[PDB]
Amino acid sequence: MQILLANPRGFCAGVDRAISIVENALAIYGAPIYVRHEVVHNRYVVDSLRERGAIFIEQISEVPDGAILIFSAHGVSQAVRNEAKSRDLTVFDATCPLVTKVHMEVARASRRGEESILIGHAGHPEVEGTMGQYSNPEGGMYLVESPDDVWKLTVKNEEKLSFMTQTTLSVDDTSDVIDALRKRFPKIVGPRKDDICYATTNRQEAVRALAEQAEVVLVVGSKNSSNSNRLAELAQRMGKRAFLIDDAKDIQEEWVKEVKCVGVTAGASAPDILVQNVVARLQQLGGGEAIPLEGREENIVFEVPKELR
Numbered sequence: 001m002q003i004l005l006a007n008p009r010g011f012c013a014g015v016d017r018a019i020s021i022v023e024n025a026l027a028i029y030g031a032p033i034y035v036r037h038e039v040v041h042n043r044y045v046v047d048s049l050r051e052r053g054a055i056f057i058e059q060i061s062e063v064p065d066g067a068i069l070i071f072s073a074h075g076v077s078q079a080v081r082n083e084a085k086s087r088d089l090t091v092f093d094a095t096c097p098l099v100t101k102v103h104m105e106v107a108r109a110s111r112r113g114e115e116s117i118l119i120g121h122a123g124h125p126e127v128e129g130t131m132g133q134y135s136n137p138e139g140g141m142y143l144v145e146s147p148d149d150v151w152k153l154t155v156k157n158e159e160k161l162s163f164m165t166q167t168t169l170s171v172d173d174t175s176d177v178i179d180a181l182r183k184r185f186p187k188i189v190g191p192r193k194d195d196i197c198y199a200t201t202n203r204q205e206a207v208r209a210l211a212e213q214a215e216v217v218l219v220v221g222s223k224n225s226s227n228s229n230r231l232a233e234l235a236q237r238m239g240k241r242a243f244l245i246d247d248a249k250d251i252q253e254e255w256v257k258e259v260k261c262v263g264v265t266a267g268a269s270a271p272d273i274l275v276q277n278v279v280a281r282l283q284q285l286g287g288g289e290a291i292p293l294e295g296r297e298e299n300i301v302f303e304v305p306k307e308l309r
């Protein structure tokens with residue numbers, strides 16, 4: 001059995017920065033360090049940080065006065081941010097810069113009382129945070145997940161309408177949503193394409209290349225990782241069996257028995273050691289040396305704030 005590795009895969013700039021923020025805060029201030037939401041959606045990372053004294057909460061009420069609070073990489077709403085500010089908390093923000101970029105646009109449309117539409121998945125923390133940048137009752141902030149949602153949406157003033165997107169969406173499905181938005185609201189304004197980040201686009205392009213070679217694709221990533229689910233989904237739609245797994249223990253022999261080519265990738269929040277362990281397991285199941293596919297070289301890095309270096 002041949003083992004192929006997708007490239008790029010694994011950690012993106014925003015996840016590496018966010019994890020460093022929490023590690024550095026723990027080393028500087030000691031435990032406990034409060035974190036609003038899993039810093040990144042990865043069980044291995046989260047479980048480990050818990051070990052070192054990080055405490056993950058959903059609501060600011062959960063945090064004691066005098067505490068240190070870090071916002072997760074997914075971002076938070078202005079209401080959350082203000083609630084944190086109204087309290088006597090020391091705050092560090094691990095929101096990824098590429099999410100903050102979207103937030104700034106939503107706040108701008110809110111200040112203008114002009115409606116905005118967000119393409120994204122209801123209930124996800126990044127969508128809650130981005131929708132939570134809009135607070136003007138004169139205008140409006142609407143969420144759409146699909147072309148059908150667009151077909152049913154009505155707005156107050158489609159002459160002054162703009163759109164944004166979640167950073168981890170399917171590139172192909174978002175394209176379909178945007179097409180619908182432009183047919184329904186011909187004066188709608190947005191970025192040149194969407195707000196899907198370089199890491200999402202690159203990992204989806206890389207899994208596409210991987211799936212054209214592999215019969216089975218294993219995506220290292222947790223269940224609640226949006227970007228990771230998009231990678232397994234993409235390979236599945238190409239007709240390959242694809243499994244989203246947290247670690248090597250999740251691999252069932254049947255998935256790879258008599259398979260000549262198995263591919264492995266990882267979501268933006270999965271540490272490389274999990275991939276190494278998955279490769280090791282596939283080897284014990286008959287696989288040979290892991291072969292990295294050629295891919296887009298990534299070079300962006302986001303530094304931690306000076307206050308935490």
Ligand SMILES: C/C(=C\COP(=O)(O)OP(=O)(O)O)CO
Binds near residue numbers: 074168226267
């Ligand atoms: C922070 C972030 C992505 C990094 O991966 P995560 O798996 O942590 O988050 P997501 O894909 O949104 O479920 C959203 O920009």
Ligand code: SF4
Binds near residue numbers: 012200
């Ligand atoms: S997936 Fe993209 S936007 Fe999200 S943390 Fe990573 S680099 Fe930032």
